[PDB]
Design a binder for this molecule. Structure first.
Ligand SMILES: Cc1ncc(C[n+]2csc(CCOP(=O)(O)OP(=O)(O)O)c2C)c(N)n1
Ligand SMILES: Cc1ncc(C[n+]2csc(CCOP(=O)(O)OP(=O)(O)O)c2C)c(N)n1
Ligand SMILES: Cc1ncc(C[n+]2csc(CCOP(=O)(O)OP(=O)(O)O)c2C)c(N)n1
Ligand SMILES: [Mg+2]
Ligand SMILES: [Mg+2]
Ligand SMILES: [Mg+2]
Lengths: 552, 539, 555
């Protein structure tokens, strides 16, 4: 019963089932303590992927995912991982080791100021300097990682602290509390402003993408019949019932129907809106608009964002109090016409161009065939790139937490490790991950962990042989691409070398059969599907806002 | 004519030959400027390895390696990379982008305090907030990265700053100056203590592992005939002439002849000694000895390290002034016997699979002296660090500061670019391999003549055997195997395999004569590893 | 003309700032120049520390952030302790400081440092604006964060070229920080349930319970349910004269109070806005399992001695009201009534001067009482740090919200007098009383010029013993000897007159009552030198009371 046991004791109380990590000499006492009791250790092939996996656990379970690494380069490898989780509202607790307290100021092996390093990228970055303080520090980490808004917590343990034998008792895993609903006066005022609105619309954001949030949002949308829009991490709010009120997903560029829908609005209700997904300077422009901020925390005042009302409190509760006293909105003919046109423009946008001819599959063809090959309840984790732009915009998701996208840091390589984390959260279910050919290699080494776990993952690789998202953004600004090209690899040979299944779409017509082959395959499968990116530049085309400008 | 050009203008003037990086929306303006002029861009497969490559360029060329990344996750991926370079005396300049100055406080895509993040892990972390300040900020970053002790410098560029058009002129790339040698009276006082010493020993350290230092160290060792020892990053100090005065490499555990040699000495002269490689509480113990600190910067006072003399100045110059007025030391009979027994003990220290010691030697005999050999981190690195002889400066590169996993392969890639047309050998573990194995694509793309050796045991053994000595059980050290040959072939590279311990020498030669990147899978018996921490030898 | 500096003033206008405390400088002068055309009144301070203190006092009294404006370099670095104090004591403060131009920000140039990096670990919000357009946003969010629970300090740094930069940027609406709804309904119901079933339920009113609107609601709860309650030092003023029979003093510093013994005997403790800085839970929540109910605007910090069984997070007054609405009077059993009776008795004996007392100087308890009797309930009393503060914090009764201000977070020396000046600006035309030690006096005594300049009606009481006594008696108790606590005397009367202020002196303990009335009736700043006998001070850390109660209870 030494300090390392205390760390494990906390993990038990927090109900931690899995720990992702990589052992080392400085953190060895805690890994040793985990052999006697505590959660199952998932050994990672890189601490970055260990942090990503934990993030996936966080977003899916609502409870902090736990990552355990050693001092020095082990700790510093969690940097990007935690930074992503901290900016994308995913509860993660990081446990890292450090050199002994007596040599903490010295130039010794793997020593640095851990707490100072993770300070600007976490909600909580502390280093325990007394063994008695372990149960407190770790508990407060779990609570703070979870408390709205969710984020990353980092706890550093000097080696002599985790090895120290102590008679210190454990501490109760007091659950993070939930707020009450927003102020009654604030809700009453909000209902009033929505009822008097000529065209009210709902902007569902990050924290609205929580399951219980989605549950309450849907009840509201059905009763009041408001047209709504999603941010990328709000994917899954849409139901097939609410398809007639759905106006797509806003993000990246102001050239979507939702942006035009938001423009026409006179009252906008934002739900759990972290502006990181889409800056308000992009959508809230052109005329005085009423903004009602509903969130678990106060609003960030921007030039383009100055809420006329703030409903701060538990997001689902606050929505419930609104939905109860709200009544159906009747739209005038003019507003109905606008909604009709936008829904028309929206449908026109989801279609492959008529003049299309190619040896490869169009991105929309890859999107459509994938959704029809994947059940609604199946979790799909997506990477970042041009492929991500298509997925975020056109891949429909009808259930909470089934389309995971990195819309905070837009970190390359998140797809596959999220999928591995997701499969452990939902055992016995197939999990689909989508990535680019460039972003793939960022975390492809974690495929060994997949085969080892026999995880039912289907990884789709959009093959263009370039960092295209940077490329077409270079062409639009400088009329030339720079440092976006790299060599190709045999993706099938790559998979097979890890002990996984590798398939390949040789022709655009084989797409449907290859996908279903993978969805029925056993174990991890990587799928190489070449794509034609000649239409990608139109993702930033302002043709659509122009057409609607003239029509108005 | 805009801020991005200024960054490149500095890179030109600094004589930067290569920039390793990955583009992004915020830093693309500088990537755009590199199309018209400036160094050749090497697109990496991960910013971690791009930073590693730059570290190798720094360690090999003496001028800072440059890495250029984007905002957000681009910047934060440099964390381990820069931290490694900063604690291992390798000059690196990192250039990262950031969000618009007007939105620097907002929750927007890829925003963080870049400068605040790299503060605890660099010698210099600044963020430029005015376009005029670019040539200054960049120039001083290079100077500080180079200045003793060398390390990592980080410069963050708001997107609007690199895109802003200005008529600001560039700034001259003033070279970091060299110090003069240590004080004359200080040099004389040191020489006095050495000639009167019964058993004087030289500890060549990190900053002694520099080329000009080694050249100057060797002249001192030949003339005075001093017994010396190496640290892991001091590999290459040994010459084939000086085999008779060499007493191995100290590190990791106190069970080496060197630890015992230093113990018996009464006066020890340390040269460019960073205590990060081996804490002085391990060797400077059993009895009072006089310590003379020779370095480019002052010493860190430790309980086991309190110098009686500090000769601070240019390392080679200070050494030359010693070598000039020093004379040969005659060793007494007792002391000569101690030196004799330990050199005997040294050789004394030197299955279905191949033994580690078999793999070290057979590689040395299969590899030319001038060929640079990069090593990763693990148990295999311990065998290499202790028994792989290097007879030329900068031919055995080891990460002895952070002990960072995955450094082997990208260092080799950086090296092939530094020494074009030369073969480069990299050694790594099977666990440490996948950390940066995706950078093999960059090697094949560059057609770099790299030879990678993978020690195959299927575990994180260095953690494993230290667990058995502490808790008598291993924890979280096991993982599955992969087909390394198929892996190589999938990248368009050559894959070989040692099926039997006798095939070792022939497979090695195949790779050394092969064209392009080659990976070699060699299985190892690690049942002997546990003796590395055995206290048998000191007893 | 519309320049960057104007945007800063425009924000202050929309925020409804009436006063700005500061000291001008070369880097921040553009904002000072802009304040000449429009904006709040500038209060020139004699040290930036006191400007931070005064701004803090305005925040604690008005609930809106007090504003402090300084220059680059040492001007900014002088705000360190001031802001650190406000940040740990729930007082809204916005600090606006200048810095060198963006082009020389990395250079060794005059008064350059990383302003933001310095104030990062001691404020809720420390940013530096690097674009003139971003000013109205940065500042507005600064005010909101400083006010948002838990209230604290925000620091905004302006490069000289940024505030001097001419820009056509529109201002941004001063959107008010919103209030939470009350705590969760099921959580409140569960709380009432655990309170009704309690043998001895007690309320611990803490820092955030000491706010006016909080106190209003707490009292209604206390009257209806008839719960015994206790105060922390910054919760002073919750007590009403109605509630005297349920009041059990103020816990703090040392565990030797009736309140500490009351909490020990309780089986259910309701904490209200309890920041543990004032008194760590390892001191009071000991010796047996107790049910803890954390009521606050933010979640709880889990300690070994503090692991709540229930958390009611939401607006503090609103949450209390829902409790008060559905709660009923608590009936105490015979055993519990006696425990309350004995403790209420022990409490009364503690507030009394010892019978064998004789001295040429005034006893601390005499100075407290005579001051309380010379001062109206509504008159704000600011207290400094030292042994005198212990007497005041424990024995000076306060019967209205925000009439006894104490620095109980950082325990910063010198806060008394500048707080009074800030108070004097908040309640113009009202007398303000400040209490300090002779050591803590000189830390900020130079602000006496600022009082005299404003002709503020302040009455400053200086406890004269000629030592750092609070350190001294704690040294004798730990080391059997004092170290570095002694210093020379100054003529406090002559000191006041030299600033143009009134100086009085209590030459004999009977003149005490008379001198105070003389001061309370004097015009302009008044300093009062009153000598004190500190021979009884060591009993403040005496463990006699817990010992007697230990024996009396084991009976
Ligand atoms: C760690 C990191 N580095 C750089 C970037 C910038 N970036 C955004 S998209 C992209 C390239 C994606 O390449 P790929 O995997 O091939 O997908 P594609 O764009 O081709 O669809 C890059 C480098 C990033 N978002 N994260
Ligand atoms: C980035 C990083 N993660 C973890 C460690 C801790 N560590 C030191 S050696 C080692 C395992 C080495 O495995 P391998 O590559 O197979 O070499 P081997 O032990 O088998 O010789 C680990 C995980 C480290 N030094 N750096
Ligand atoms: C800035 C600061 N310095 C030191 C202390 C420690 N301290 C607390 S009370 C005290 C001495 C108080 O002297 P005085 O004002 O004369 O009051 P007295 O103790 O005599 O009642 C000291 C030094 C502190 N709380 N803050
Ligand atoms: Mg691609
Ligand atoms: Mg291995
Ligand atoms: Mg005193």
């Amino acid at each position: 019963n030494r300090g390392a046991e205390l760390v494990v004791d906390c993990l038990v109380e927090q109900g931690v089932t899995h720990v992702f990590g990589i052992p080392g000499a400085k953190i060895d006492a805690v890994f040793d303590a985990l052999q006697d009791k505590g959660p199952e250790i998932i050994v990672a092939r890189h601490e970055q992927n260990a942090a990503f996996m934990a993030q996936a656990v966080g977003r899916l379970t609502g409870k902090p995912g736990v990552v355990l690494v050693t001092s020095g380069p082990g700790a510093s490898n969690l940097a990007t991982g935690l930074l992503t989780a901290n900016t994308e509202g995913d509860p993660v607790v990081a446990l890292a080791g450090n050199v002994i307290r007596a040599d903490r100021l010295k130039r010794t092996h793997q020593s640095l100021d851990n707490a100072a390093l993770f300070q600007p990228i976490t909600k909580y970055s502390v280093e325990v300097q007394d063994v008695k303080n372990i149960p407190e520090a770790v508990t407060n980490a779990f609570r703070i990682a979870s408390a709205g808004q969710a984020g990353a917590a980092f706890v550093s343990f000097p080696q002599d602290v985790v090895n120290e034998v102590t008679n210190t008792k454990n501490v109760r895993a007091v659950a993070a509390p939930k707020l009450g609903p927003a102020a009654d006066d604030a809700i009453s005022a909000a209902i009033a402003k929505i009822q008097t609105a000529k065209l009210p619309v709902v902007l569902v954001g990050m924290k609205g993408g929580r399951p219980e949030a989605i549950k309450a949002v849907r009840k509201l949308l059905k009763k009041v019949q408001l047209p709504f829009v999603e941010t990328y991490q709000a994917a899954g709010t849409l139901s097939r019932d609410l398809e007639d009120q759905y106006f797509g997903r806003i993000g990246l560029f102001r050239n979507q129907p939702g942006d035009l829908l938001l423009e026409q609005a006179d009252v906008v209700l934002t739900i759990g809106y972290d502006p990181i997904e889409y800056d308000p300077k992009f959508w809230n422009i052109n005329g005085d608009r009423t903004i009602i901020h509903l969130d678990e925390i106060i609003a960030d005042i921007d030039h383009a964002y100055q809420p006329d009302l703030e409903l701060i409190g538990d997001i689902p509760s606050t929505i419930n109090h609104i939905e109860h006293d709200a009544v159906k909105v009747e739209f005038a003919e003019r507003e109905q016409k606008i909604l009709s046109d936008l829904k028309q423009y929206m449908h026109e946008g989801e279609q492959v161009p008529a003049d299309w001819k190619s040896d490869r599959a169009h991105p929309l063809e890859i999107v459509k065939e994938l959704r029809n090959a994947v059940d609604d309840h199946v979790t799909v984790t997506c990477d970042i790139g041009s492929h991500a732009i298509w997925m975020s915009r056109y891949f429909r998701s009808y259930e909470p937490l089934t389309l995971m996208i990195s819309n905070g840091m837009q970190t390359l390589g998140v797809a596959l490790p999220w999928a591995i984390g997701a499969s452990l959260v939902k055992p016995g279910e197939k999990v689909v991950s989508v990535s680019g050919d460039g972003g793939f290699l960022f975390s492809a080494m974690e495929l060994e962990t997949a085969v080892r776990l026999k995880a039912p993952i289907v990884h789709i690789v959009w093959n263009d042989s370039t960092y295209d998202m940077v490329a077409f953004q270079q062409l639009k600004k400088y009329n030339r691409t720079s440092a976006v090209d790299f060599g190709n690899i045999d993706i099938v040979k790559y998979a097979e070398s890890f002990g996984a299944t590798g398939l390949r779409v040789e022709s655009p017509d084989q797409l449907a059969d290859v996908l279903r082959q993978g969805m029925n395959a056993e174990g991890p499968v990587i799928i190489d599907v070449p794509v034609d990116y000649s239409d990608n530049i139109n993702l930033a085309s302002d043709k659509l806002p122009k057409e609607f400008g003239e029509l108005m």
